[PDB]
Enzyme design. Structure first.
Site, PDB file in Angstrom:
ATOM      1  CB  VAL A 161      19.754  -5.617  20.671  1.00  0.00           C
ATOM      2  CG1 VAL A 161      20.351  -4.745  21.775  1.00  0.00           C
ATOM      3  CG2 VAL A 161      19.983  -7.069  20.932  1.00  0.00           C
TER       4      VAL A 161
ATOM      5  CE  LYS B  24      15.481  -9.995  22.762  1.00  0.00           C
ATOM      6  NZ  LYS B  24      15.638 -11.241  23.548  1.00  0.00           N
TER       7      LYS B  24
ATOM      8  CG  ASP C 276      20.698 -19.532  23.040  1.00  0.00           C
ATOM      9  OD1 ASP C 276      21.806 -20.102  22.992  1.00  0.00           O
ATOM     10  OD2 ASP C 276      20.405 -18.561  22.314  1.00  0.00           O
TER      11      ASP C 276
END
Ligand SMILES: Nc1nc2c(ncn2[C@@H]2O[C@H](COP(=O)(O)OP(=O)(O)O)[C@@H](O)[C@H]2O)c(=O)[nH]1
Ligand SMILES: [Mg+2]
Ligand SMILES: [Zn+2]
Lengths: 1045, 385, 250, 328
Positions: free
Chosen positions: A1, A14, A89
């Site tokens: 991040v 990222k 996810d």
């Protein structure tokens, strides 16, 4: 991040054939509105919030917005489904809720594994546990397909409604995979049973039992997620999910336009607010700020108290800190309105108003720009009552009296500060709006001690009578509140205001006493003193005072007892009434009974005198004599007072007016002291080389069979065109002097004009007909060419014939302008076939016989057949008057002087008079008198008239050539009349002499006596051209054209 | 100062406030005002209504020490009394210059030295007291006497009002008379202005209308006179036409009498013999000079000025050229006769003569085919014209 | 062109009231027969009344500050205040459509005023340029000058032809001929006075001062101070400000 | 210890001992004009406090009092008693000034009211008549203005017609003068032509001084006037052309040498021609004989110098020439 910066905003960067997966994901999700894949060691828009933080952040995700983000999480998982996308996810820390409630499902990672081992948790920790909160939503099936994502989304919605409470850990979910675990205890933290069942359905251990996100959205269509969403707020918010509306101004614009649709369609309003407020902070232009403020004002009544006090009020303050003064005033006004719409007190708004809002408005109360203090003056009378009301509603939820006293003290401080701010207008505004209501926030003793004195200070500022009138407008309210312990303080001050200089201050203080007595705030003895002092103002010359005094005296007649009314009001009112009234309480009777005021002139001449005290001394003595206290009326000590008194008695002041000037004396002197303390050229195509005509005819063309009456030279084409009543408009070559003839126009033909900047001529007929002729005399086939190209006919009943024509070329438009029998000169745009200006003539002047238009097209002159001329300004096409003729004889010909700008040559019928009139002076300032009849005599003894004029700028000599009925062609030299002579007649014709005799200031050149080539008849034309020598071209009334070389 | 026997009464009381009102109509702030009973005689006191409150601080307002406080509270002008405080001021306990409430439905008074809540150097000598009491008694009795006087004056004001009502009607009637008089006066001024203005423009109307009638009259009579002049113009035009016919008859009579004298003739070879001389196209000198005079007289008879004027002599007839630029003062004149050393001058002179012949034919109207025929063209002119 | 902005001329607006002009709405006799108070009004003294022009500035309907009154001036022959009012507004307080409602008040009775005409004039006229000139405004009779947007009582719109060329003239856009122009301007004022005499209505002369510490030839114009991202965010990274609101409470 | 307080100053009182003497007489004459609720020195001080409380209950002041406060409030009460007595006199004076105002008769005021109402009503009808007159005046104004503007349109039409007429009139005057000028020229030329013999125009036999010239060419040469041979030969040529034309007009000839147009014997031969011409008129019309006599062989002319003789000849021929024109 890696949160970083980019030219539009922050960006998430990222770092861990893998590059092709994101290409496919991007080309799939480029259309998704509630989804955001990697835009490309990877990148992604930075959104405002998480879901978890947005639960945590102070504007709390209320249940409606929680339902909305479930709506949009389902919608985003669906959109990924249809576009063939699956993240795998989903979580609370990746359903990124941008500022305006737009749910972005972020960074679809197809590099995450589809299926995982059950006993190895390292994959879960790395891939799925970025926040390391260990709340696992991996599909029970997994240990990539759609039901898996749906299960994760159901876990996410369960976490959303459980205020962040995790629905699964890793151990919980492992136990759930073996069927051993059912988390419904955590499920009991869901607020509403609809989400209970929605999560239940979506979290079942068997994947095939799970419906589709599209199916679930279908199912939950009003039990949980209202139809208002599906109808309005899905595509409407999708409007803002696109790149064009880059700046807050535009979102405010769109929503201002859509306000009616949104309100009447929609409660989803809270969702809207996340949009609107996201712009409030970043509005650029003043129009945007004001628009957002009115938008918020209209929204607020349809939002609830918690919503307002949370997400609107702090933004209203953020504006009240901002720069633009209109924005400050509107921020305070919106703040007052929004807080006025409030009727609940949440727990955390326990003491908002003293602790938060009033500190925020204080710097407005001080603020320099006048409008801001004006707004605060008008708005404190409502902010303070919102304070009291709000802190009263609070107790439904510390020592209250201390809070109330703190509020009273802040309100008191602000009132006094605004009455100390220098602007008289801010003081007046507060006194109009908030002083009355804020007295209650004082309490008497503090009010009497602070507010009354602060108000009294204004009566000192003698310059601005508006402030003192304002003081008297709100003194009623303060002396109402403070009550009876201020009447003694105020009575002399109100007497000060009554006797003041500016008489509208007297009016406003008469109203002050009106209302203040109407509340019974004056001592009874003070009531009588004020009535006795306002007695004079009934007979004040002014009308606003006179009437206001009437009002006060009526009002006192109504407040205090009719016993008092009689006993003291009547004996004070005896002078300024006419009739012994009974109903002082009838304004009717009083106004119909007041004596006529001392005339404003008498009254001001009494006031104007310096040392007016001696004036009153002598007036007072005159009163004693008029009543007998003194035996006589001696002149005074100072003869200046006798002088003034005698001047004023010259106005005849009635003795009654003397008594009245005595009665007003108190006010009179006090007011006296109070103010004591205060590319175009006339040069045609031919420049004349023929300085002197020879009097020598080279052609005797009798081709015309009737009288020839017009000649126009054109050296654009080296032709000259003549016309005659036989209707033959013959075009004659100049090099040959008929190269061409034309008779199709028919009838008598005496008018024509060549065009200055083209190849064609224009002709006019007695029929009323205007035509053209394309001319080909330069090109030479076996014969030159005529070319009729025109038609125009006009009924003589309204449009008329052509008296004279003249073509001038003023740019793109090409104007051919012609007279008419009706006299309305008309400008036809030959280049456009539509006329330009219709200069209508005043037919009372008579038929227009000649006109001549300025060379620079500034003004055109007209000469009527009455001899009365005219002039026109063609920049506005407005008429200008012109000097008539002393003899009022028909003006045949007119012209514009070469040397002189404003000089108009008219050859007048009779006595062969040719007079030069100057239009600027409106008189005749040169004259030619050929006839031996008495000079400038109106007898008109001579029948002879002149109608051929050629005026030329030759060698600085305005060489003139006049030809008329005497059969003689006359040369004149307008500077050296010794040069003038005649070229006509035979050798037997006697010679003449040319005198200069100055008559009447006007100048008169005079002509007096000491085979026949000359025309045997009237020479009715003169024009000029040249090829090698200058030629005069003349024509007779017999039909003969001759040309003199 | 906490002593007793300190005089402390309603007159010392100017503040009344209430705190912690618990409303029997649920959670909502009443609009609370209050009333004081003379402690149960009819209440008389009414503060302004503090809308939307439960802990008010009402604005306040006589030697009595006990009184009844009751509070009305109820929103939208419908009101409910929720208090019973029969309070003797002597029973109150002192809080220091700040209202502090701890009970519910609490009312707190406020007196000169602080606030009051329900709990849980020499003097004037006696001669001064007698003087003071007698002065207060004189005030009492004189004020009471003035009240008696005022009530008597008001009773007689009513007794006279029995007819003063008609007097006030009379005042209203006189006011109506005066209002009507001023209104009629200003309307009559409007009438005067309008009448004067209208009379002015009516006389103007008659003047301009009679002017228009006279103008139309002069237009018709002018048209009549113009038509008379039209007939006169036709008459004189025809008279001139016949005169010109006589002119041209005479002109050709004398032209023929002229023309006999200068002979012309033919030969079989189509040539022109002139008095018997051969003439090729442009004695010979004598006949040509005859032609020159012939032309000059033809100019003199037909009144057509010569393009180049002829200074006539019989055979030495010269023709002057004033027009050409290329000729100087001496070169203005050409001959029609052969002049020594001037063959070109003579030739161009005969040319100019031929041009004069062309001019004469053109002015007569005869188109001339060839301008080198001198005598043939003029003979033709005489034959035709 | 020499011009300055209205947000920059940070002075109170001065407004000259020159003269109300024209035939006033003389009420019928029955108007005063039913309203005896009317008898004492300012109309019913045929001497020119003691009017005062409350000049309140407006903008998009909002009243912008308080009304001013002409300092008392008694009249006998004409309504020549010629008198300046110091508007409570400053030029930066004037937005684009800001328009002054001049209500020409008179007295109807003790303590009560009844408007006699009211003119709503765009202070910022066509093209936004401030009314830097002496104006004649229509006087919507007996109606208070309404400043709502759009104006109910507009003060202004042959002159449509005159004015364009006139400004083209004295701004140099046009031919200059001295005598001709002056005689025409005489004609122009004849046309203007004929138009004024034509209307039964009332018309008011007003004026705008232009006195600044600068080279004094300047016009006043309404002015004010001025793909990594896929979902634009109007609050990209700024202060969570409701949070601060709540934090300031305990 | 303090026992009482200045109730209008909040200050302690030192008790004045005089009260120790006060009796029942003085004191007797002095003492006269939801729910919630709440030893001798000793006797004389308690009596003093009781009287203080009684006095605060009786009157609107709160005993006891400072001597400063008592005297100051005595000044205030004195001012207020002067004011009260002043106002009592005011109200008395008002009582007698109202009593002197008589109880007016109601009936007289009744006829007053009726008369005033009648006058007001009559004035109302007068104002109604005034409004009627306003209406008729306004109607007259409207219709008179309509008439005036109607006549304005009449003026427009008349002006258009009058313009046409005047154009035609002025054009006709132009044409009138035109015809007149043409007439004069025709008359003049016709007169000169008719009164002129074709020969005489061709050969202008007119006297210029001591010559009688022909077309203004000298006939005759003097020693003082230089006259070349060309001039005299041209003049003679015109003379001979004249007699050749007279031959062609009357039919005469010498038959041996007929004098055909030409240009001592020469003009001597010409003499005989005129002699023949003289005979020819004498043979033709005996009504006229030529003035200046002729003889052939002598070549002689009698005045019935050489230039004078010739001057007579053209003079003579002129006589013959005029007769030749008149004969036909
Ligand atoms: N508020 C906020 N947090 C972010 C944003 N982008 C990333 N984060 C944080 O960064 C983490 C990214 O990890 P996550 O999405 O759970 O797994 P990933 O697939 O590796 O990105 C999240 O847990 C967020 O807490 C953003 O735009 N706004
Ligand atoms: Mg992320
Ligand atoms: Zn004291």
């Amino acid at each position: 991040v890696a949160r970083a910066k980019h030219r539009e905003g922050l960006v998430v960067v990222k770092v861990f054939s893998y590059k092709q997966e994101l290409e496919e994901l991007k080309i799939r999700l480029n259309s998704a509105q509630n989804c955001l894949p990697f835009q490309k060691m990877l990148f992604r828009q930075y959104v405002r919030d998480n879901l978890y933080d947005r639960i945590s952040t102070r504007p709390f995700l209320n249940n409606i917005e929680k339902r909305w983000i479930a709506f949009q999480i389902l919608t985003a998982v669906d959109q990924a489904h249809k576009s063939g996308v699956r993240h795998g996810d989903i979580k609370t820390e990746n359903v990124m809720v941008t500022s305006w409630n737009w749910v972005l499902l972020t960074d679809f990672a197809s590099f995450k594994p589809t299926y995982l081992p059950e006993d190895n948790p390292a994959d879960f920790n790395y891939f799925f546990d970025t926040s390391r909160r260990r709340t696992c939503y991996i599909a029970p099936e997994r240990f990539l397909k759609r039901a898996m994502d749906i299960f994760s989304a159901g876990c996410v919605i369960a976490e959303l409604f459980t205020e962040g409470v995790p629905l699964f850990d890793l151990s919980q979910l492992l136990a759930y995979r073996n069927g051993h675990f059912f988390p419904e205890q955590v499920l009991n933290k869901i607020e509403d049973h609809s989400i209970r069942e929605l999560v239940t359905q979506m979290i079942h251990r068997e994947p095939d039992k799970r419906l589709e996100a599209e199916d679930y959205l279908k199912q939950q269509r009003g039990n949980a997620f209202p139809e208002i969403f599906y109808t309005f707020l899905q595509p409407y918010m999708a409007q803002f999910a696109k790149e064009t509306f880059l700046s807050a101004d535009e979102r405010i614009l769109v929503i201002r336009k859509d306000l009616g649709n949104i309100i009447h369609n929609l409660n989803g309003l809270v969702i809207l607010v996340s949009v609107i407020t996201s712009c409030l902070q970043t509005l650029k232009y003043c129009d945007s700020k004001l628009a957002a403020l009115e938008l918020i004002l209209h929204l607020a009544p349809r939002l609830s108290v918690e919503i307002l006090l949370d997400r609107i009020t702090p933004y209203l303050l953020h504006f009240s800190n901002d720069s633009v003064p209109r924005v400050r005033a509107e921020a305070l006004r919106t703040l007052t309105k929004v807080l006025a719409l409030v009727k609940e007190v949440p727990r955390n708004d326990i003491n908002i108003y003293p602790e938060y809002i009033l500190p925020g408005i204080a710097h407005l109360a001080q603020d320099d720009a006048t409008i801001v203090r004006l707004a605060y003056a008008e708005n404190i009378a409502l902010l303070a009552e919102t304070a009291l009301r709000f802190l009263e509603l609070v107790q439904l939820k510390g020592n209250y009296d201390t809070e109330l006293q703190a509020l009273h003290e802040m309100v008191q401080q602000k009132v006094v500060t605004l009455l100390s701010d220098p602007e008289n207008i801010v003081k007046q505004t507060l006194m109009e709006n908030g002083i009355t209501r804020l007295c209650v926030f004082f309490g008497r003793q503090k009010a009497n001690d602070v507010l009354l004195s602060h108000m009294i200070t204004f009566l000192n500022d003698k310059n601005d009578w508006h402030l003192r009138g304002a003081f008297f407008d709100s003194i009623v309210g303060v002396a109402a509140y403070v009550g009876w312990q201020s009447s003694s303080i105020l009575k002399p001050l109100l007497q000060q205001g009554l006797s003041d200089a500016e008489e509208f201050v007297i009016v406003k203080a008469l109203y002050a006493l009106t209302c203040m007595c109407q509340l019974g705030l004056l001592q009874k003895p003070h009531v009588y003193e004020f009535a006795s002092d306002i007695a004079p103002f009934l007979c004040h010359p002014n009308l606003w005072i006179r009437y206001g005094a009437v009002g006060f005296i009526t009002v006192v007649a109504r407040q205090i007892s009719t016993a008092d009314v009689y006993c003291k009001l009547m004996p004070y009112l005896d002078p300024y009434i006419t009739q012994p009234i009974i109903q002082i309480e009838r304004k009717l009777v009083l106004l119909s009974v007041l004596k006529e005021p001392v005339s404003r002139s008498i009254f001001d001449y009494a006031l104007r005198s310096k040392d007016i005290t001696s004036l009153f001394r002598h007036l007072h003595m005159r009163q004693k004599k008029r009543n007998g206290s003194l035996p006589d009326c001696p002149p005074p000590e100072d003869p200046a007072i006798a002088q003034l008194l005698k001047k004023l008695l010259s106005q005849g002041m009635t003795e009654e007016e003397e008594d009245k000037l005595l009665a007003l004396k108190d006010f009179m002197m006090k007011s006296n002291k109070a103010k004591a303390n205060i590319n175009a050229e006339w040069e045609s195509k031919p420049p004349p080389p023929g300085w002197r005509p020879k009097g020598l005819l080279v052609a005797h063309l009798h081709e015309h069979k009737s009288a020839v009456n017009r000649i126009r030279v054109s050296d654009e084409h080296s032709l000259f065109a003549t016309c005659s009543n036989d209707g033959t408009v013959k075009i004659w070559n100049s090099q040959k002097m008929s190269i061409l003839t034309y008779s199709r126009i028919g009838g008598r033909v005496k008018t024509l004009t060549f065009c200055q900047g083209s190849h064609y001529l224009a002709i006019a007929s007695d029929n009323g007909a205007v035509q053209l002729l394309g001319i080909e005399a330069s090109k030479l086939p076996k014969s030159p060419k005529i070319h009729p190209l025109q038609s125009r006919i006009l009924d003589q009943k309204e449009d008329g014939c052509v008296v004279d024509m003249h073509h001038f070329n003023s740019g793109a438009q090409s104007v051919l302008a012609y007279a008419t029998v009706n006299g309305s000169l008309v400008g036809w745009d030959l280049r456009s076939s539509s006329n330009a200006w219709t200069l209508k003539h005043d037919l009372k002047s008579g038929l227009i016989t000649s006109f001549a238009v300025d060379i620079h097209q500034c003004w055109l002159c007209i000469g009527t057949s009455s001899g009365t001329m005219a002039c026109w300004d063609m920049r506005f096409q407005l008429p200008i008057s012109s000097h008539c003729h002393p003899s009022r004889a028909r003006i045949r010909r007119l012209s514009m002087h070469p040397l002189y700008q404003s000089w108009v040559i008219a050859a007048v019928q009779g006595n062969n008079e040719v007079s030069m009139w100057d239009m600027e002076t409106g008189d005749r300032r040169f004259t030619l008198w050929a006839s031996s009849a008495p000079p400038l005599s109106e007898l008109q003894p001579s029948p002879h008239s002149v109608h051929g004029i050629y005026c030329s700028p030759a060698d600085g000599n305005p060489i003139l050539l006049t030809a008329g009925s005497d059969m003689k062609i006359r040369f004149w030299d307008l500077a050296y009349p010794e040069r003038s002579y005649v070229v006509a007649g035979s050798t037997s014709s006697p010679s003449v002499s040319y005198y200069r005799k100055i008559i009447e200031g006007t100048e008169v050149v005079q002509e007096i006596q000491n085979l026949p080539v000359g025309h045997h008849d009237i020479i009715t034309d003169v024009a000029t051209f040249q090829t090698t020598q200058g030629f005069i071209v003349t024509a007779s009334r017999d039909g003969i054209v001759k040309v003199w070389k | 100062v906490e002593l007793p026997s300190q005089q402390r009464r309603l007159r010392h009381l100017r503040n009344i406030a209430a705190r912690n009102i618990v409303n029997r109509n649920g959670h909502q702030l009443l609009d609370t005002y209050f009333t004081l009973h003379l402690c149960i005689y009819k209440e008389f006191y009414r503060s302004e209504v503090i809308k939307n409150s439960l802990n008010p601080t009402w604005r306040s307002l006589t030697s009595v020490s006990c009184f009844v406080v009751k509070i009305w509270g109820g929103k939208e002008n419908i009101y409910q009394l929720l208090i019973e405080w029969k309070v003797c001021l002597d029973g109150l306990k002192y809080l220091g210059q700040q209202i502090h409430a701890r009970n519910q439905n609490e009312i707190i008074f406020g007196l000169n030295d602080g606030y009051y809540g329900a709990p849980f150097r020499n003097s004037y000598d006696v001669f001064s007291l007698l003087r003071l009491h007698r002065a207060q008694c004189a005030i009492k009795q004189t004020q009471v006497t003035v009240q008696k006087i005022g009530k008597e004056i008001e009773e007689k004001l009513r007794l006279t009002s029995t007819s003063n009502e008609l007097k006030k009607k009379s005042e209203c009637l006189q006011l109506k008379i005066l209002v009507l008089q001023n209104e009629l006066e200003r309307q009559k001024k409007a009438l005067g202005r309008e009448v004067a203005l209208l009379h002015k423009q009516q006389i103007a109307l008659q003047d301009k209308g009679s002017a228009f009638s006279a103008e139309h009259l002069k237009l018709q009579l002018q048209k009549e006179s113009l038509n008379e002049l039209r007939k006169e113009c036709t008459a004189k035009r025809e008279l001139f036409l016949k005169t010109n016919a006589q002119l041209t008859i005479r002109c050709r009579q004398l032209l023929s009498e002229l023309s006999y004298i200068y002979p012309i003739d033919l030969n079989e070879h189509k040539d022109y013999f002139v008095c018997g001389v051969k003439l090729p196209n442009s004695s010979i000198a004598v006949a040509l000079g005859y032609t020159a005079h012939l032309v000059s007289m033809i100019s003199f008879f037909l009144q057509v000025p010569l393009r180049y004027p002829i200074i006539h002599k019989g055979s030495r007839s010269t023709i002057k050229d004033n027009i050409n630029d290329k000729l100087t003062e001496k070169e203005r004149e050409f001959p029609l006769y052969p002049k020594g050393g001037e063959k070109l001058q003579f030739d161009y002179g005969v040319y100019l003569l031929n041009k004069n012949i062309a001019q004469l034919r053109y002015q007569h109207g005869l188109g001339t085919p060839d301008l080198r025929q001198t005598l043939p063209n003029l003979k033709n002119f005489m034959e035709h014209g | 062109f020499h011009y300055i902005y209205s947000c920059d001329l940070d002075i109170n607006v001065q407004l000259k009231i020159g003269s109300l002009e024209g035939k006033r709405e003389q009420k019928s006799y029955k108007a005063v027969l039913e309203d005896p108070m009317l008898k004492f009004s300012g109309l019913y003294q045929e001497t020119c009344s003691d009017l005062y022009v409350t000049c309140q500035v407006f903008a998009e309907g909002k009243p912008l500050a308080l009304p001013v009154r002409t300092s008392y001036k008694a009249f006998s022959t004409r309504w020549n205040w010629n008198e300046w009012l110091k508007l409570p507004v400053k030029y930066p307080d004037l937005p684009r459509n800001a328009q002054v409602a001049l209500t020409i008040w008179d007295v109807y009775g003790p303590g009560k005023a009844v408007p006699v005409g009211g003119t709503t004039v765009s202070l910022f006229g066509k093209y936004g340029m401030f009314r830097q000139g002496m104006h004649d405004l229509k006087v919507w009779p007996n109606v208070e000058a309404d400043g709502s947007e759009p104006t109910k009582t507009p003060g202004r719109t042959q002159m449509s032809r005159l004015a364009k060329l006139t400004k083209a003239h004295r701004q140099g856009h046009m031919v200059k001929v001295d005598w001709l122009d002056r005689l025409t301007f005489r004609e122009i004022e004849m046309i203007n006075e004929s138009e004024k005499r034509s209307s039964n209505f009332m018309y008011l002369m007003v004026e705008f001062r232009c006195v600044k510490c600068d080279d004094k030839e300047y016009g006043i114009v309404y002015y004010e101070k001025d793909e990594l991202v896929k979902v634009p965010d109007p609050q990209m990274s700024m202060e969570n400000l409701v949070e601060s609101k709540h934090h300031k409470l305990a | 210890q303090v026992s009482f307080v200045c109730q209008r100053c909040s200050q302690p009182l030192k008790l004045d001992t005089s009260f120790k003497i006060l009796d029942r007489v003085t004191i007797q004459e002095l003492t006269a004009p939801s729910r919630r609720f709440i030893e001798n020195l000793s006797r004389r001080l308690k009596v003093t406090g009781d009287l203080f409380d009684i006095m605060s209950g009786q009157t609107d002041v709160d005993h006891p009092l400072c001597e400063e406060c008592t005297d100051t409030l005595l000044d205030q009460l004195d001012t207020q008693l002067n004011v009260t007595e002043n106002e009592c006199q005011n109200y008395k004076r008002c009582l007698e000034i109202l009593e002197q105002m008589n109880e007016d008769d109601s009936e007289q005021l009744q006829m007053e009211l009726k008369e005033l109402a009648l006058e007001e009503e009559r004035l109302i009808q007068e104002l109604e008549d005034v409004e009627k007159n306003r209406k008729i005046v306004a109607e007259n104004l409207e219709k008179v203005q309509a008439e005036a503007e109607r006549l304005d349109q009449e003026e427009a039409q008349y002006q258009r017609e009058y313009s046409e007429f005047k154009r035609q009139q002025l054009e006709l005057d132009d044409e009138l003068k035109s015809v007149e000028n043409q007439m004069r020229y025709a008359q003049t030329q016709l007169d000169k032509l008719k009164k002129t013999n074709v020969f005489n125009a061709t050969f202008h036999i007119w006297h210029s001084g001591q010559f009688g010239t022909i077309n203004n060419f000298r006939l005759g040469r003097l020693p003082s006037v230089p006259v070349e041979w060309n001039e005299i030969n041209a003049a003679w040529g015109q003379t001979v052309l004249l007699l050749h034309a007279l031959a062609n007009k009357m039919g005469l000839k010498f038959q041996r040498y007929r004098l055909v147009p030409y240009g001592d014997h020469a003009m001597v031969a010409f003499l005989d021609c005129v002699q023949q011409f003289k005979e020819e008129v004498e043979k033709g019309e005996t009504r006229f004989c030529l003035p200046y006599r002729m003889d052939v062989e002598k070549g002689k002319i009698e005045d019935t110098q050489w230039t004078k003789a010739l001057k007579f000849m053209l003079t003579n021929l002129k006589w013959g020439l005029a007769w030749v024109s008149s004969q036909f």
